[PDB]
Coordinates of C-alpha atoms and ligand atoms in Angstrom, one line a residue:
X1 CA -11.1 0.6 -35.1
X2 CA -7.4 0.9 -35.8
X3 CA -5.6 -2.0 -37.5
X4 CA -1.9 -2.5 -36.8
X5 CA 0.4 -5.3 -37.8
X6 CA 3.5 -5.7 -35.6
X7 CA 6.0 -8.1 -37.2
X8 CA 3.6 -10.0 -39.6
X9 CA 1.1 -10.3 -36.8
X10 CA -2.3 -8.6 -36.9
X11 CA -4.0 -6.7 -34.1
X12 CA -7.2 -4.7 -34.1
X13 CA -7.4 -2.0 -31.4
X14 CA -9.3 1.2 -30.5
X15 CA -7.0 2.7 -27.8
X16 CA -4.7 5.5 -28.7
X17 CA -1.5 4.6 -27.0
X18 CA 2.2 4.3 -27.9
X19 CA 3.8 1.3 -29.6
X20 CA 5.7 0.3 -26.4
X21 CA 2.5 0.5 -24.3
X22 CA 0.4 -1.6 -26.7
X23 CA 3.3 -4.1 -27.1
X24 CA 3.7 -4.3 -23.3
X25 CA 0.0 -5.2 -22.9
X26 CA 0.1 -7.8 -25.7
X27 CA 3.3 -9.7 -24.6
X28 CA 5.7 -8.6 -27.3
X29 CA 9.4 -7.8 -26.6
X30 CA 10.3 -4.2 -27.4
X31 CA 13.2 -3.2 -25.1
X32 CA 13.0 0.1 -23.2
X33 CA 15.5 2.0 -21.0
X34 CA 15.1 5.8 -20.5
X35 CA 11.3 5.5 -20.4
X36 CA 9.9 5.5 -16.9
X37 CA 7.3 7.5 -15.0
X38 CA 5.4 8.3 -18.1
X39 CA 8.3 10.1 -19.7
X40 CA 11.6 9.5 -21.6
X41 CA 14.8 11.5 -21.7
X42 CA 13.3 14.3 -23.7
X43 CA 16.7 15.8 -24.3
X44 CA 18.8 13.0 -25.9
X45 CA 16.7 9.9 -25.8
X46 CA 18.3 6.5 -25.4
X47 CA 16.6 4.7 -28.4
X48 CA 16.7 1.2 -27.0
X49 CA 13.0 1.2 -27.9
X50 CA 13.5 1.9 -31.6
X51 CA 11.2 0.3 -34.1
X52 CA 10.7 0.7 -37.8
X53 CA 7.5 2.2 -39.3
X54 CA 7.1 1.4 -43.0
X55 CA 8.0 4.3 -45.2
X56 CA 8.8 6.6 -42.2
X57 CA 11.8 4.8 -40.8
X58 CA 13.3 4.2 -37.4
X59 CA 11.3 5.9 -34.6
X60 CA 11.3 5.6 -30.8
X61 CA 8.4 3.3 -29.7
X62 CA 8.1 4.8 -26.1
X63 CA 6.5 7.9 -27.5
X64 CA 5.4 7.0 -31.1
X65 CA 1.6 6.6 -31.0
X66 CA -0.1 3.9 -33.1
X67 CA -1.9 4.8 -36.3
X68 CA -4.4 2.8 -38.3
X69 CA -2.6 0.9 -41.1
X70 CA 0.8 0.5 -39.5
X71 CA 3.4 -2.2 -40.1
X72 CA 6.0 -2.2 -37.4
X73 CA 9.4 -4.1 -37.2
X74 CA 10.9 -4.7 -33.7
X75 CA 13.1 -7.8 -33.8
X76 CA 14.3 -6.6 -37.3
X77 CA 17.7 -6.3 -38.8
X78 CA 18.2 -2.5 -39.3
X79 CA 16.4 -1.9 -35.9
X80 CA 18.6 -4.3 -33.9
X81 CA 21.7 -2.7 -35.4
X82 CA 20.7 0.8 -34.3
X83 CA 19.9 -0.4 -30.8
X84 CA 23.3 -2.3 -30.4
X85 CA 25.0 0.8 -31.7
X86 CA 23.4 2.7 -28.8
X87 CA 24.2 0.0 -26.3
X88 CA 27.9 0.0 -27.4
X89 CA 28.1 3.7 -26.6
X90 CA 26.7 3.4 -23.1
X91 CA 28.6 0.1 -22.6
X92 CA 31.7 2.2 -23.2
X93 CA 31.2 4.5 -20.2
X94 CA 30.5 1.7 -17.9
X95 CA 32.6 -1.3 -16.4
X96 CA 31.8 -5.0 -16.4
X97 CA 31.9 -5.3 -12.6
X98 CA 28.7 -7.3 -12.1
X99 CA 30.4 -9.2 -9.2
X100 CA 30.8 -7.1 -6.9
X101 CA 28.1 -4.8 -8.1
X102 CA 25.1 -4.2 -5.8
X103 CA 22.8 -4.4 -8.8
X104 CA 24.1 -7.7 -10.6
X105 CA 21.1 -9.9 -9.6
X106 CA 18.5 -7.4 -10.8
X107 CA 20.3 -5.0 -13.0
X108 CA 18.5 -4.0 -16.4
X109 CA 21.6 -3.1 -18.4
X110 CA 23.1 -6.5 -17.7
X111 CA 19.9 -8.1 -19.0
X112 CA 20.3 -6.1 -22.2
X113 CA 24.0 -6.9 -22.5
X114 CA 23.3 -10.7 -22.8
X115 CA 20.1 -10.1 -24.8
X116 CA 21.7 -8.2 -27.6
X117 CA 25.2 -9.7 -27.1
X118 CA 26.3 -6.2 -26.5
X119 CA 29.9 -5.5 -26.8
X120 CA 32.1 -2.6 -25.8
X121 CA 34.3 -1.1 -28.6
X122 CA 36.8 -0.1 -25.9
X123 CA 36.4 -1.2 -22.2
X124 CA 35.9 1.8 -19.9
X125 CA 38.5 1.4 -17.2
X126 CA 39.1 4.7 -15.3
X127 CA 42.5 4.7 -13.3
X128 CA 40.9 6.6 -10.5
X129 CA 37.2 6.6 -9.7
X130 CA 37.3 9.6 -7.2
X131 CA 36.0 12.2 -9.7
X132 CA 33.0 10.0 -10.4
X133 CA 32.3 9.1 -6.8
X134 CA 30.3 11.0 -4.3
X135 CA 30.0 9.6 -0.8
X136 CA 29.6 12.9 1.1
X137 CA 25.9 12.3 1.9
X138 CA 24.5 10.5 4.9
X139 CA 21.8 9.0 2.8
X140 CA 22.7 9.0 -0.9
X141 CA 25.9 7.9 -2.8
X142 CA 26.7 8.3 -6.5
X143 CA 29.1 6.3 -8.7
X144 CA 29.1 8.0 -12.1
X145 CA 31.3 5.2 -13.6
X146 CA 28.0 3.2 -13.6
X147 CA 25.8 6.2 -14.9
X148 CA 24.4 5.8 -18.3
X149 CA 22.5 9.2 -18.0
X150 CA 19.1 8.1 -18.9
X151 CA 17.5 10.9 -16.9
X152 CA 15.3 8.6 -14.8
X153 CA 16.4 10.0 -11.4
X154 CA 15.8 13.6 -12.6
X155 CA 12.3 12.7 -13.9
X156 CA 11.4 10.7 -10.8
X157 CA 12.6 13.5 -8.5
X158 CA 10.5 16.0 -10.5
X159 CA 7.3 13.8 -10.5
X160 CA 7.6 12.4 -6.9
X161 CA 8.9 15.5 -5.0
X162 CA 8.7 18.5 -7.4
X163 CA 11.8 19.8 -5.6
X164 CA 13.9 19.0 -8.8
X165 CA 16.9 18.4 -6.4
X166 CA 18.4 15.9 -8.8
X167 CA 19.5 17.9 -11.8
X168 CA 21.5 17.6 -15.0
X169 CA 24.7 19.5 -14.4
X170 CA 27.4 20.7 -16.7
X171 CA 30.9 19.8 -15.5
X172 CA 33.7 20.8 -17.8
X173 CA 31.7 20.7 -21.0
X174 CA 30.3 17.3 -20.1
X175 CA 26.9 16.3 -18.6
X176 CA 26.6 14.6 -15.3
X177 CA 23.7 14.2 -12.8
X178 CA 23.9 15.5 -9.2
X179 CA 22.6 18.1 -6.8
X180 CA 22.5 21.9 -7.3
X181 CA 25.9 23.3 -8.0
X182 CA 27.3 19.8 -7.6
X183 CA 27.0 20.1 -3.8
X184 CA 26.5 17.2 -1.4
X185 CA 22.7 16.4 -1.6
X186 CA 22.4 17.1 2.1
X187 CA 23.4 20.7 1.7
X188 CA 20.7 21.3 -0.9
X189 CA 16.9 21.2 -0.8
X190 CA 17.0 17.4 -1.4
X191 CA 14.7 15.4 1.0
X192 CA 17.0 12.4 0.8
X193 CA 13.9 10.3 0.1
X194 CA 15.7 8.0 -2.3
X195 CA 13.1 7.9 -5.1
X196 CA 16.0 8.6 -7.5
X197 CA 17.7 5.3 -6.4
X198 CA 14.3 3.5 -7.1
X199 CA 14.2 4.9 -10.7
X200 CA 17.9 4.1 -11.4
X201 CA 18.4 1.0 -13.7
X202 CA 22.0 0.5 -12.6
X203 CA 24.4 0.8 -9.6
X204 CA 25.1 4.5 -10.2
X205 CA 22.7 5.7 -7.5
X206 CA 22.8 3.9 -4.2
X207 CA 22.2 4.3 -0.5
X208 CA 25.0 5.3 1.9
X209 CA 26.0 1.9 3.4
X210 CA 25.8 1.4 7.1
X211 CA 26.6 -2.3 7.2
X212 CA 30.3 -1.9 8.1
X213 CA 29.0 -0.1 11.3
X214 CA 26.8 -3.2 11.8
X215 CA 29.5 -5.9 11.2
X216 CA 32.1 -4.1 13.4
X217 CA 29.4 -4.0 16.2
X218 CA 28.7 -7.7 15.8
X219 CA 32.4 -8.5 16.0
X220 CA 33.0 -6.0 18.9
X221 CA 33.3 -8.2 22.1
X222 CA 31.7 -5.8 24.5
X223 CA 28.9 -4.6 22.3
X224 CA 25.3 -5.7 22.8
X225 CA 23.7 -5.3 19.4
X226 CA 20.0 -4.6 19.1
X227 CA 18.1 -4.8 15.8
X228 CA 14.6 -3.6 14.9
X229 CA 12.8 -3.5 11.6
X230 CA 10.4 -0.9 10.2
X231 CA 6.8 -1.8 9.3
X232 CA 7.4 -2.0 5.6
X233 CA 10.4 -4.5 5.7
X234 CA 8.2 -7.6 6.5
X235 CA 6.0 -6.6 3.6
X236 CA 8.7 -6.4 0.9
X237 CA 12.1 -8.1 1.5
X238 CA 10.7 -11.5 0.4
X239 CA 10.6 -10.1 -3.1
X240 CA 14.4 -10.3 -3.0
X241 CA 14.2 -14.0 -2.2
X242 CA 11.8 -14.8 -5.1
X243 CA 8.9 -15.4 -2.8
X244 CA 6.7 -12.9 -4.7
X245 CA 4.7 -9.8 -3.9
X246 CA 2.6 -9.1 -0.9
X247 CA 4.3 -11.9 1.2
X248 CA 4.3 -11.6 4.9
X249 CA 7.7 -12.6 6.1
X250 CA 7.8 -11.2 9.7
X251 CA 8.6 -14.5 11.4
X252 CA 11.3 -15.5 8.9
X253 CA 13.1 -12.1 9.4
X254 CA 13.3 -12.6 13.2
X255 CA 15.0 -16.0 12.7
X256 CA 17.3 -14.6 10.0
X257 CA 18.4 -11.7 12.3
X258 CA 19.2 -14.3 15.0
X259 CA 21.3 -16.3 12.5
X260 CA 23.3 -13.1 11.7
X261 CA 24.4 -12.8 15.4
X262 CA 22.1 -10.0 16.8
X263 CA 21.8 -10.1 20.5
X264 CA 18.2 -8.7 20.7
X265 CA 15.5 -8.9 18.0
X266 CA 13.1 -6.1 18.6
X267 CA 10.8 -4.1 16.3
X268 CA 10.2 -0.5 15.2
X269 CA 6.4 -1.1 15.4
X270 CA 6.9 -1.0 19.2
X271 CA 8.4 2.4 18.6
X272 CA 5.4 3.3 16.4
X273 CA 3.1 2.6 19.3
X274 CA 5.4 4.9 21.4
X275 CA 5.1 7.7 18.8
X276 CA 1.3 7.5 18.8
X277 CA 1.5 7.4 22.6
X278 CA 3.2 10.8 22.7
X279 CA 1.5 12.3 19.5
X280 CA -2.1 11.4 20.3
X281 CA -1.7 13.0 23.8
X282 CA -0.2 16.1 22.2
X283 CA -3.1 16.2 19.7
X284 CA -5.6 16.0 22.7
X285 CA -3.6 18.8 24.4
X286 CA -3.7 20.9 21.2
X287 CA -7.4 20.5 20.8
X288 CA -7.5 22.0 24.3
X289 CA -8.0 25.4 22.8
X290 CA -5.6 25.9 19.9
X291 CA -2.3 24.0 20.2
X292 CA -1.5 25.6 17.7
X293 CA -3.3 24.2 14.7
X294 CA -2.5 22.4 12.5
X295 CA -0.4 19.7 14.1
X296 CA 1.7 18.0 11.5
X297 CA 3.3 14.5 11.7
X298 CA 7.1 14.5 12.3
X299 CA 8.0 10.9 11.6
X300 CA 8.9 11.1 8.0
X301 CA 12.4 12.6 7.7
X302 CA 11.9 13.4 4.0
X303 CA 9.0 15.6 5.0
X304 CA 10.9 17.1 7.9
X305 CA 13.6 18.3 5.5
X306 CA 10.9 19.5 3.1
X307 CA 9.4 21.6 5.9
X308 CA 12.9 22.8 6.9
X309 CA 13.7 23.8 3.4
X310 CA 10.4 25.1 1.9
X311 CA 8.1 25.8 4.8
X312 CA 10.2 26.7 8.0
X313 CA 7.1 28.4 9.5
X314 CA 5.5 25.0 9.9
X315 CA 8.4 23.6 12.0
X316 CA 6.7 24.8 15.2
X317 CA 3.4 23.0 14.3
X318 CA 5.3 19.7 13.8
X319 CA 4.6 17.2 16.5
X320 CA 7.2 17.1 19.4
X321 CA 7.2 13.2 19.4
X322 CA 10.3 11.6 17.9
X323 CA 9.9 9.3 14.9
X324 CA 9.4 5.5 15.7
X325 CA 13.1 4.9 14.9
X326 CA 14.4 7.7 17.1
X327 CA 11.9 7.2 20.0
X328 CA 12.7 3.5 20.0
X329 CA 16.4 4.4 19.9
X330 CA 16.1 6.8 22.9
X331 CA 14.4 4.0 24.9
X332 CA 17.2 1.6 23.6
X333 CA 19.8 3.4 25.7
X334 CA 17.7 4.2 28.7
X335 CA 14.8 1.8 29.3
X336 CA 16.4 -1.3 27.8
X337 CA 19.7 -1.0 29.9
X338 CA 17.4 -0.8 33.0
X339 CA 16.0 -4.3 32.5
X340 CA 19.0 -6.5 31.4
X341 CA 21.8 -4.8 33.6
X342 CA 23.9 -3.5 30.9
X343 CA 25.8 -0.3 30.5
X344 CA 24.1 2.1 27.9
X345 CA 27.6 2.7 26.5
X346 CA 27.9 -0.9 25.3
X347 CA 24.5 -1.2 23.6
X348 CA 24.6 -0.6 19.8
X349 CA 21.2 -0.1 18.0
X350 CA 20.6 -1.1 14.4
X351 CA 17.4 -0.4 12.4
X352 CA 16.2 -1.9 9.1
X353 CA 14.4 0.7 7.1
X354 CA 12.6 1.1 3.7
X355 CA 14.3 4.5 3.7
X356 CA 17.5 6.3 2.9
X357 CA 16.4 9.5 4.7
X358 CA 16.3 7.6 8.0
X359 CA 20.2 7.4 7.8
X360 CA 20.3 11.2 7.9
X361 CA 17.8 11.3 10.8
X362 CA 19.8 8.8 12.9
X363 CA 23.0 10.7 12.1
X364 CA 21.6 14.1 13.1
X365 CA 23.9 15.8 15.7
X366 CA 21.4 16.3 18.5
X367 CA 19.8 12.8 18.2
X368 CA 21.7 11.7 21.3
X369 CA 21.9 12.0 25.0
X370 CA 25.1 12.2 27.0
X371 CA 27.2 11.0 24.1
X372 CA 25.0 7.9 23.3
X373 CA 23.3 7.9 19.9
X374 CA 19.6 7.2 19.8
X375 CA 20.2 5.0 16.7
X376 CA 23.8 3.9 15.8
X377 CA 23.1 2.4 12.4
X378 CA 20.3 2.1 9.8
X379 CA 20.6 -0.4 7.0
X380 CA 18.0 -0.5 4.3
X381 CA 15.8 -3.4 3.2
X382 CA 18.3 -4.1 0.4
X383 CA 21.2 -4.0 2.8
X384 CA 19.7 -6.6 5.2
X385 CA 18.9 -8.7 2.1
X386 CA 22.6 -8.8 1.2
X387 CA 23.6 -9.5 4.8
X388 CA 21.3 -12.6 4.9
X389 CA 22.5 -13.7 1.4
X390 CA 26.3 -13.3 2.2
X391 CA 25.8 -15.5 5.3
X392 CA 24.0 -18.1 3.1
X393 CA 21.1 -18.3 5.5
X394 CA 18.2 -19.9 3.5
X395 CA 15.4 -17.2 4.0
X396 CA 12.5 -18.9 2.2
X397 CA 13.0 -22.2 3.9
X398 CA 13.3 -20.7 7.4
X399 CA 11.2 -21.5 10.4
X400 CA 9.3 -18.7 12.1
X401 CA 10.2 -17.1 15.3
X402 CA 8.9 -14.2 17.4
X403 CA 10.6 -11.0 18.6
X404 CA 11.9 -10.7 22.1
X405 CA 8.9 -9.1 23.8
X406 CA 10.1 -6.1 25.9
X407 CA 10.6 -3.8 22.9
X408 CA 9.4 -6.1 20.2
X409 CA 5.6 -6.4 20.8
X410 CA 3.2 -4.3 18.6
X411 CA -0.4 -3.5 18.1
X412 CA -2.4 -3.2 14.8
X413 CA -2.2 0.6 14.9
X414 CA 1.6 0.5 14.8
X415 CA 1.5 -2.1 12.1
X416 CA -0.2 0.1 9.4
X417 CA 2.4 2.8 9.8
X418 CA 4.3 1.9 6.6
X419 CA 1.3 2.8 4.4
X420 CA -0.1 6.3 3.6
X421 CA -2.9 7.2 6.1
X422 CA -1.3 4.6 8.5
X423 CA 0.0 7.1 11.1
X424 CA -3.3 9.1 10.8
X425 CA -5.6 6.0 11.5
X426 CA -3.3 4.8 14.4
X427 CA -3.2 8.3 16.0
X428 CA -7.0 8.8 15.7
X429 CA -7.6 5.4 17.5
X430 CA -5.6 6.6 20.6
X431 CA -6.7 10.3 20.3
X432 CA -10.4 9.7 20.3
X433 CA -10.0 7.1 23.2
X434 CA -7.9 9.6 25.2
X435 CA -10.1 12.7 24.7
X436 CA -13.4 10.9 25.4
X437 CA -11.9 8.6 28.0
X438 CA -13.4 5.5 26.5
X439 CA -12.5 2.2 24.9
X440 CA -14.2 2.9 21.5
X441 CA -15.0 -0.1 19.3
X442 CA -15.0 1.8 16.0
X443 CA -11.4 2.1 15.0
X444 CA -11.5 2.0 11.2
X445 CA -10.7 5.2 9.3
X446 CA -11.0 3.8 5.8
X447 CA -11.5 7.3 4.3
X448 CA -7.8 8.4 5.0
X449 CA -6.6 5.1 3.4
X450 CA -5.4 4.5 -0.1
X451 CA -3.5 5.8 -3.0
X452 CA -5.2 9.2 -3.5
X453 CA -2.8 12.1 -3.4
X454 CA -4.8 14.3 -1.0
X455 CA -7.2 12.6 1.3
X456 CA -9.4 14.5 3.9
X457 CA -11.8 13.5 6.6
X458 CA -13.9 14.9 9.3
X459 CA -13.6 13.1 12.6
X460 CA -15.9 13.6 15.5
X461 CA -14.2 13.8 19.0
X462 CA -16.3 14.7 22.1
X463 CA -19.2 15.6 19.9
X464 CA -17.1 18.2 18.2
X465 CA -15.9 18.2 14.6
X466 CA -12.2 18.2 13.6
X467 CA -10.6 18.1 10.2
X468 CA -7.7 15.9 9.2
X469 CA -5.8 15.5 6.0
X470 CA -3.3 12.9 4.7
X471 CA -0.7 14.1 2.2
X472 CA 0.5 11.2 0.1
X473 CA 3.9 12.2 -1.3
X474 CA 6.0 15.4 -1.3
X475 CA 4.7 16.7 -4.6
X476 CA 1.2 16.7 -3.1
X477 CA 2.4 18.7 -0.1
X478 CA 3.5 21.4 -2.6
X479 CA 0.1 21.1 -4.3
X480 CA -1.7 21.3 -0.9
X481 CA 0.1 24.4 0.2
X482 CA 0.5 26.4 -3.0
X483 CA -3.1 25.9 -4.1
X484 CA -4.3 27.2 -0.7
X485 CA -6.3 23.9 0.1
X486 CA -4.6 24.3 3.5
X487 CA -6.9 27.4 4.0
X488 CA -10.3 26.0 2.9
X489 CA -10.9 25.0 6.6
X490 CA -9.1 24.9 9.9
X491 CA -7.1 21.7 9.8
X492 CA -6.4 20.1 13.2
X493 CA -4.1 17.2 12.3
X494 CA -2.1 16.5 9.0
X495 CA -0.1 13.4 8.2
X496 CA 2.6 13.9 5.5
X497 CA 4.7 11.2 3.9
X498 CA 7.4 12.1 1.3
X499 CA 7.0 8.9 -0.7
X500 CA 3.9 8.2 -2.7
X501 CA 2.1 5.2 -1.2
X502 CA 3.9 5.8 2.0
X503 CA 7.0 4.0 3.4
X504 CA 6.1 0.8 1.5
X505 CA 7.3 2.7 -1.6
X506 CA 10.3 4.3 0.3
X507 CA 13.8 4.9 -1.0
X508 CA 15.6 1.9 0.5
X509 CA 13.1 -0.6 -0.9
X510 CA 13.5 -3.5 -3.4
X511 CA 13.8 -2.5 -7.1
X512 CA 11.0 -4.1 -9.1
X513 CA 12.0 -4.7 -12.8
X514 CA 9.6 -2.8 -15.2
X515 CA 7.9 -6.0 -16.5
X516 CA 6.7 -6.7 -13.0
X517 CA 6.2 -3.0 -12.4
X518 CA 3.5 -2.9 -15.1
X519 CA 1.5 -5.8 -13.8
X520 CA 1.8 -5.3 -10.1
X521 CA 0.4 -2.4 -8.1
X522 CA 3.4 -2.3 -5.7
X523 CA 2.1 0.2 -3.2
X524 CA -1.3 -1.6 -2.9
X525 CA 0.2 -5.1 -2.5
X526 CA 3.0 -4.2 0.0
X527 CA 0.5 -2.2 2.1
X528 CA -2.1 -5.0 2.1
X529 CA 0.4 -7.1 4.2
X530 CA 0.3 -4.4 6.9
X531 CA -3.5 -3.9 7.0
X532 CA -4.1 -7.7 7.1
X533 CA -1.7 -7.8 10.1
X534 CA -3.9 -5.1 11.8
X535 CA -7.1 -7.0 11.1
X536 CA -5.8 -10.3 12.6
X537 CA -4.1 -8.6 15.5
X538 CA -6.0 -8.8 18.8
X539 CA -4.6 -5.4 20.1
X540 CA -5.2 -2.7 17.5
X541 CA -4.6 0.4 19.6
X542 CA -1.1 1.6 20.5
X543 CA -1.9 2.3 24.1
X544 CA -3.1 -1.4 24.6
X545 CA 0.4 -2.8 23.8
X546 CA 1.3 -4.8 27.0
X547 CA 5.0 -4.3 26.7
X548 CA 4.6 -0.6 26.0
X549 CA 2.2 -0.1 29.0
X550 CA 4.7 -1.5 31.5
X551 CA 7.7 0.5 30.0
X552 CA 5.7 3.6 30.6
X553 CA 4.5 2.5 34.1
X554 CA 7.9 1.3 35.4
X555 CA 10.2 3.9 33.6
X556 CA 8.8 6.9 31.7
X557 CA 5.6 7.6 33.6
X558 CA 2.6 9.0 31.6
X559 CA 2.8 10.3 27.9
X560 CA 3.7 13.8 27.1
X561 CA 4.7 14.6 30.7
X562 CA 7.8 14.7 33.0
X563 CA 10.3 12.1 31.8
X564 CA 8.4 11.2 28.6
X565 CA 8.3 14.9 27.6
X566 CA 12.0 15.6 28.4
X567 CA 13.8 12.7 26.4
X568 CA 11.3 11.2 23.9
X569 CA 10.7 14.4 21.9
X570 CA 12.5 16.6 19.4
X571 CA 11.6 20.0 18.1
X572 CA 13.2 21.6 15.0
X573 CA 14.1 25.3 15.1
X574 CA 15.7 25.5 11.6
Ligands
LIG1 O1 11.1 4.3 6.8 C1 10.1 4.3 7.2 FE1 8.4 4.3 8.0 O2 6.0 7.2 8.6 C2 8.1 2.5 7.5 O3 7.9 1.5 7.2 S1 6.3 4.5 8.9 FE2 8.0 4.9 10.4 O4 6.4 6.8 11.5 C3 9.4 5.4 11.5 O5 10.3 5.7 12.1 C4 7.4 3.7 11.6 O6 7.0 2.9 12.4 S2 8.6 6.5 8.8 C5 9.3 3.4 9.7 O7 10.1 2.8 10.1
LIG2 S1 25.4 -1.5 -13.1 FE1 24.7 -3.5 -14.0 S2 25.9 -3.8 -16.0 FE2 26.9 -2.2 -14.7 S3 28.6 -3.3 -13.5 FE3 26.6 -3.2 -12.2 S4 25.5 -5.1 -12.6 FE4 27.1 -4.8 -14.2
LIG3 S1 22.1 8.0 -11.9 FE1 20.9 6.2 -12.7 S2 18.7 7.0 -13.2 FE2 20.1 8.8 -13.0 S3 20.7 9.3 -15.1 FE3 22.4 7.9 -14.2 S4 21.9 5.8 -14.8 FE4 20.0 7.1 -15.1
LIG4 S1 16.5 11.8 -2.6 FE1 14.4 12.4 -3.3 S2 14.4 14.8 -3.2 FE2 16.7 14.1 -3.2 S3 17.4 14.1 -5.5 FE3 16.6 12.0 -4.9 S4 14.3 11.9 -5.5 FE4 15.1 14.1 -5.4
LIG5 S1 7.6 8.2 3.3 FE1 8.8 6.7 4.7 S2 10.4 5.8 3.3 FE2 9.7 7.8 2.3 S3 11.1 9.5 3.1 FE3 9.3 9.3 4.5 S4 10.0 7.9 6.2 FE4 11.3 7.6 4.4
LIG6 S1 13.0 4.1 -23.9 FE1 12.4 5.2 -25.8 S2 14.1 6.8 -26.3 FE2 14.6 5.7 -24.3

């Protein structure tokens, strides 16, 4: 047993771990900043975690392992001086702009300003922010005035995607972060997933705003503005209203959206039942001899870009069905003008996503028909959260309401989409039903569920064995392919998500604060909201959705054929 005494207080312990980790578990207050995702900034560390080890001196706690017979000083004198020295070097390449900063209510640096009574030697006040600002991307923006180059985005991009698209760059003898050759992220191998935003402690990395598009549509007299939220939104935005974690707020969001002035309150889970409608039929048609195989999902835009950039040979194997966002959006300007005698031209479609990559997808040139965009705007979870807050609508005290039915109803299959293995379980519910022409009772595919990186399963369809895999996160796609696991058998259907945990851990999601990030399993608790909705739902198959069935009978006519084949699909060729 190792005996350590941190600040006159004794602890006996056997675990070999760092001083920050042990002082995190036993509620002691060592402050950290560049440490995240099991790694600090290896090249020029921040030292906000400096402690004193007797005889040795001031060391960085985030990577100094505990030894038997230590005496450690954290709230010390010499230690607190070295940390404020570091804080008044970073708060010197930053501006006190907390209102109107998008990060003031949950910053991390602002917390450590008032904690240490951190003062700037000279206030950093650039006359022109243009050199620091990058708004060229459809998904990501950078404001280097706020960057305290901790390296967390570079590390998170390396651990989560292994693309290393977020790099440390040298610009005129100085170090900045950005894409390769300081290009716009969109023009590099970046998947636009937004995990770098999720690891950023400040306002430096942010999503490209689409809420000026939204407010102008709401104020435009002729425009009939439709909104629809992604599966993961109802499972997470309540964190931004101090409601906690794993809180189902579906009904409160529908009310809130009506108080913001939206004309129709629909839901992307209806579009998720549409995507399974097309994709499960295509899978049954591919099983009719070859297809080819494997069929891959095409609903994660982060993954589509990974395929386009690293595996262009797989772009043909990708499912023709549009993503829920895009397929809902195509129906927004065609089926929804049919009922409600409106001109397609005057309908404006807004989606609320846990994703930054969705903004690139919606803005793709060919995601339109006859000049009308499938989706006109995509605000993230965080952006809808600010809309609600600016309007002072009291989210947590709100009464529940339902969505307008025609394009707002959803089944349990569409509900679990926001979690990893969600699209796989939903597709297999309709694919085994279609191929066997039966209403099967056994619908749970628990073996493709969960937080494992690579999950496989053998499903039986028409007394024949098929192999399916679920790739949880873009780094694991690289592992899948490069290791040759892809060749250990003939795979028939493969789900790929770019974010680990699925869309519930997407790039446009609420930031967590590392104290709560150590105690809460975010991916598990956000996803449990979705699965619990599936369990209590009476319809748990996409083709059983009553509103979906009559769109297809009165307007598209049969999945994967004629009208449904011509406008509800998209194939990538580069
Ligand atoms: O963002 C995201 Fe997602 O795999 C989530 O939540 S799950 Fe999706 O197929 C789509 O489109 C669906 O439905 S991608 C969301 O909206
Ligand atoms: S990034 Fe944080 S400390 Fe900096 S201006 Fe914004 S809220 Fe203030
Ligand atoms: S953009 Fe954010 S996460 Fe990346 S190095 Fe700068 S402050 Fe750190
Ligand atoms: S959006 Fe994703 S792939 Fe692009 S730099 Fe950020 S973490 Fe890397
Ligand atoms: S997993 Fe979801 S949130 Fe992440 S890039 Fe893909 S669609 Fe976006
Ligand atoms: S948190 Fe330890 S050197 Fe940055």
